[PDB]
Design a protein around this ligand. Structure first.
Ligand code: GP5
Length: 220
């Protein structure tokens, strides 16, 4: 009935980029744990307050806290098509997911470390606004500064080479049971390469099997 789709891959792999193309071609919003984590911190909710207790201590917010805030969001979006970016991260989150839907489509992105490192080295942000500047696509009008405020741009910690390598290894270690699970159900589609542009046509085709591509009024 409603679509239940998932895009997985290590940080830097282009999950956000693919989700954005899916929005422009299908009108399908994507849902991510980081985005819902932000939203809960801004609203100062009970789960937001739990996450902040970890963050204040420079601790990773545990998977179970993320499962909690994600299931709560999905359980309140039961009449919507879902496109999940990077969730489930773990086998236990995949199983949590199983209780409230049947996952139709899983896209896995396998991108070499060198590409990950080179993509993320080219990303800068304006931290207060969260405006993101990809230097190969949308660089700031003036070098080093935000387009509105002219305040200096920052490189996110996770975007630096050592952090990129650490996060890739963290991903590899956790990803295998999740990919195996969806592989045995026949819903997993795996893509490798260095260019999102080259992977996109295959992903497009998979979504158009499930939901109608948007066309313009005068395309008839
Ligand atoms: N336990 C726990 N888990 C968490 C927590 N928060 C989030 N999680 C999640 O951990 C996730 C990792 O999430 P993250 O929020 O820390 O980071 P992530 O969603 O992996 O974001 P990234 O922005 O690092 O990666 P991604 O969305 O895959 O990349 P993006 O599409 O933004 O591309 C990166 C750059 O490459 C560029 N790009 C893309 N394709 C190409 C291309 O073809 N060519 C070039 N030159 N550039 C390209 C883009 O313009 C972009 O600048 C798991 O899956 C869970 O969802 C948490 O607090 N605790």
């Amino acid at each position: 009935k409603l679509l239940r789709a998932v895009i997985l891959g290590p940080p830097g792999s282009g999950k956000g980029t693919v989700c954005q193309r899916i929005a422009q071609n299908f009108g399908l919003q994507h849902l991510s744990s980081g985005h819902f984590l932000r939203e809960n911190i801004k609203a100062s909710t009970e789960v937001g307050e739990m996450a902040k207790q970890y963050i204040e201590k420079s601790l990773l917010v545990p998977d179970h806290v993320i499962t909690r805030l994600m299931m709560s969001e999905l359980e309140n979006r039961r009449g919507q098509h879902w496109l999940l970016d990077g969730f489930p991260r773990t086998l236990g989150q995949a199983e949590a997911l199983d209780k409230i839907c049947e996952v139709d489509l899983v896209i896995s992105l396998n991108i070499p470390f060198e590409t990950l490192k080179d993509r993320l080295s080219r990303r800068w942000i304006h931290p207060p606004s969260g405006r993101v500047y990809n230097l190969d696509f949308n660089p700031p009008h003036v070098h080093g500064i935000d387009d509105v405020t002219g305040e200096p741009l920052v490189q996110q910690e996770d975007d630096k080479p050592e952090a990129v390598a650490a996060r890739l290894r963290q991903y590899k270690d956790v990803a295998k049971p999740v990919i195996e699970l969806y592989k045995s159900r026949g819903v997993l589609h795996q893509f490798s390469g260095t260019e999102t542009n080259k992977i996109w046509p295959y992903v497009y085709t998979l979504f158009s099997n499930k939901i109608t591509p948007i066309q313009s009024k005068e395309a008839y």
